[PDB]
Amino acid sequence: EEWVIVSDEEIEEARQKA
Amino acid sequence: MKFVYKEEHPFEKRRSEGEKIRKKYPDRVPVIVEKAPKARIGDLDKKKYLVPSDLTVGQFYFLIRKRIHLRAEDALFFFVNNVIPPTSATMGQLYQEHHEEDFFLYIAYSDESVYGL
Ligand code: NI
Ligand code: NI
Ligand code: NI
Numbered sequence: 001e002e003w004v005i006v007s008d009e010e011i012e013e014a015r016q017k018a
Numbered sequence: 019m020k021f022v023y024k025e026e027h028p029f030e031k032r033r034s035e036g037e038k039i040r041k042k043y044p045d046r047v048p049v050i051v052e053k054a055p056k057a058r059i060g061d062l063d064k065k066k067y068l069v070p071s072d073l074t075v076g077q078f079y080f081l082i083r084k085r086i087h088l089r090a091e092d093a094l095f096f097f098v099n100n101v102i103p104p105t106s107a108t109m110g111q112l113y114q115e116h117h118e119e120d121f122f123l124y125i126a127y128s129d130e131s132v133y134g135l
Contacts, residue, residue, distance in 0.1 A: 003066045014077040
């Protein structure tokens with residue numbers, strides 16, 4: 001029921017591998 | 019395109035949750051992610067994601083891939099209204115064009131390049 005608020009580092013990992 | 023989430027929660031309740039979550043996290047877009055019907059691919063533990071509006075679709079591909087534990091050899095396709103969104107588009111752009119009336123963006127994922135195959 002709760003939302004996954006993707007963390008700033010997992011966001012940063014995604015910006016690197018892209 | 020059918021989403022189990024919409025079958026299991028009625029519209030009014032979804033809509034009132036979407037209003038609260040757009041207010042609580044205005045900088046983020048709320049995304050319901052579900053496996054496409056007849057897809058042969060890892061299951062996704064959780065459906066509900068808050069993501070920065072300037073995250074690209076390509077970056078969202080990376081985030082979902084990792085949660086379903088796909089090797090980059092494996093393929094992953096998103097669909098929004100039966101259409102693969104552009105990889106370079108941002109989740110904010112997708113949300114503005116394609117949010118549904120409950121204030122959620124609905125994205126199906128699959129291993130196949132056509133929704134429902
Ligand atoms: Ni509900
Ligand atoms: Ni469009
Ligand atoms: Ni609207």
